[PDB]
Design a binder for this molecule. Structure first.
Ligand SMILES: OC[C@H]1O[C@H](O[C@H]2[C@H](O)[C@@H](O)[C@@H](O[C@H]3[C@H](O)[C@@H](O)[C@H](O)O[C@@H]3CO)O[C@@H]2CO)[C@H](O)[C@@H](O)[C@@H]1O
Length: 383
C-alpha cells in the first residue's frame, strides 16, 4: 500500500476521520493515517512542518489561510488533476469557496465544506420569559433587549453566548456585525462598525454574556447553550449534531439580527479546504483521496451536520424537525456570506481586528479609537 498522512481539526463526530475509515476499507492500494489537530494549531503546526520538511500529504486548512500557503509554494498545483477528474468539477462549487483555493490563475486545493454563523435560541427559555418563541429577535435592539430579559443569574443563565476570542474566532464573529452596519475588513472603522463594537461592549458590560467570551471558542461557548446556561448562541452548522444529543430543550435557529430593518443580512464565509502539500511523494494517490471525500459530500449534512461547498448537491431534509429548521436557516444565511480575503496577509489583518475588539471590550480603548487603529494597520498589511 501507499500510505498517506492527513491532518485536520475534525474530531470523532466530524467528517475527516470517518471519511478516512471508509476510504481505508476500500483496500484500493492506498491507506490514510490521521492526525487530529486543535484550531489554533492548524496554521502553526502546518507551516512548521512544511518549513521542517515533514508536512503531511493532505491538510484541511481554514479557507482564509489558503492564500498564504498557496502564494508561498507550500501547496501542490492541482489544476491538471482537477481537469482530468469527473468527480471534482469546478462547476460544482460555490464561487467563493472555489476562489479561496485559487492563486495566480491556478487551483491549489479543493473546497471541503462551507458555512456561516446564525442565531440559535432556546424556545423554552423564551416562553418562560413571556417572549414569543415564534418571533425571535430581528434587530440588534431586539437582540439586546431579549438578552437582558433572558439573563438570569439565579440559574446561571446568560442571555447570549458568542466568541470574542483573540484569534480568528473573534474576527469571524465580529465581521458579520460590522458588515451588516456597512463596513468591511478594508474599511473597518466606519460609524456602523463602531456601533457594532459598542453593542458587543453592552453584552459584556451588562453581564448578558460570560466574561469568558473574551477567551473562549465558538465551540466551547455553544456547549454552555447546550447545557441551558445561555438562552441564545451565535454559532455555525458544526454545532448541530452535538446540539441534537446534548440540548435538552426545544430550540430554533434564525438569521443574524440586523442593525436596522433596512440593513440586509451579511456574514463571513466559513469552513475549510482540502490541500495537498507541494513535496508529497504521492500526488496522484493524495488526489484520489480528495476525490473520494468529494464523492461523499452528498451525505455530509445527514452524517455530520455540515454543509457542502457545492451548488450541484442542494442539501435534502433529514427528517429531524430541529435539524431541518437549522438547515433552512443556515442555507439562507450562507447566501450572504462574504470572503475573508483573498490575502496571504490574512492573519495580520485579523490580528488588527482582534486587538481592536480586545481593546474596546476591556474598556481600555474606545470603540472608535480601537477600530481607527485597526484600520491604519490594515491599510499597511493589506496593501
Ligand atoms: O473560529 C473561526 C472559525 O470558525 C469556524 O470553525 C469551526 C470549525 O469549522 C469547527 O470544526 C469547530 O472546530 C472545533 C473542533 O471541531 C473541535 O474538535 C475542537 O476541539 O475545537 C475546534 C475549534 O473550536 O468549531 C470552529 C469554531 O470554534 C469556521 O469554520 C472557520 O472558517 C472560522 O475561521
Amino acid at each position: 500500500d501507499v500510505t498517506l498522512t492527513l491532518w485536520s481539526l475534525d474530531r470523532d463526530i466530524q467528517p475527516a476521520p470517518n471519511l478516512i475509515k471508509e476510504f481505508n476499507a476500500l483496500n484500493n492500494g492506498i491507506k490514510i493515517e490521521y492526525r487530529q489537530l486543535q484550531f489554533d494549531d492548524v496554521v502553526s503546526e502546518s507551516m512548521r512542518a512544511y518549513s521542517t520538511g515533514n508536512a503531511p500529504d493532505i491538510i484541511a486548512i481554514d479557507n482564509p489561510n489558503h492564500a498564504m500557503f498557496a502564494s508561498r509554494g507550500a501547496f501542490l498545483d492541482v489544476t491538471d488533476m482537477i481537469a482530468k477528474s469527473d468527480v471534482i468539477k469546478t462547476e460544482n462549487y460555490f464561487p467563493g469557496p472555489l476562489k479561496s483555493v485559487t492563486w495566480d490563475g491556478k487551483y491549489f486545493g479543493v473546497p471541503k465544506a462551507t458555512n456561516t454563523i446564525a442565531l440559535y435560541y432556546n424556545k423554552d427559555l423564551f416562553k418562560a420569559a413571556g417572549l414569543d418563541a415564534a418571533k425571535p429577535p430581528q434587530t440588534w435592539d431586539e437582540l439586546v433587549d431579549a438578552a437582558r430579559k433572558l439573563t438570569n443569574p439565579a440559574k446561571n443563565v446568560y442571555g447570549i453566548s458568542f466568541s470574542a476570542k483573540a484569534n480568528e474566532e473573534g474576527t469571524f464573529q465580529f465581521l458579520p456585525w460590522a458588515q451588516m452596519a456597512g463596513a468591511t475588513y478594508k474599511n473597518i472603522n466606519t460609524d456602523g462598525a463602531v456601533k457594532a463594537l459598542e453593542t458587543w461592549k453592552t453584552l459584556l458590560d451588562e453581564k448578558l454574556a460570560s466574561p469568558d467570551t473574551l477567551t473562549r471558542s465558538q465551540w466551547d461557548s455553544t456547549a454552555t447553550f447546550n447545557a441551558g446556561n445561555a438562552a441564545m448562541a451565535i454559532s455555525g452548522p458544526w454545532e448541530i449534531d452535538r446540539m441534537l444529543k446534548d440540548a435538552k430543550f426545544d430550540w430554533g435557529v434564525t438569521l443574524l439580527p440586523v442593525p436596522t430593518p433596512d440593513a440586509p443580512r451579511s456574514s463571513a464565509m466559513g469552513d475549510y479546504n482540502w490541500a495537498i502539500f507541494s513535496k508529497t511523494k504521492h500526488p496522484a494517490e493524495a488526489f484520489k483521496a480528495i476525490e473520494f471525500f468529494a464523492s461523499k459530500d452528498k451525505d455530509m449534512f445527514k452524517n455530520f451536520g455540515q454543509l457542502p461547498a457545492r451548488s450541484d448537491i442542494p442539501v435534502p431534509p433529514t427528517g429531524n424537525a430541529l435539524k431541518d429548521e437549522a438547515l433552512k436557516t443556515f442555507v439562507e444565511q450562507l447566501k450572504y456570506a462574504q470572503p475573508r480575503g483573498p490575502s496571504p496577509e490574512w492573519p495580520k489583518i485579523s490580528k488588527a481586528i482582534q486587538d481592536a475588539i480586545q481593546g474596546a471590550l476591556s474598556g481600555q480603548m474606545t470603540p472608535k479609537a480601537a477600530l481607527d487603529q485597526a484600520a491604519e494597520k490594515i491599510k499597511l498589511v493589506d496593501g
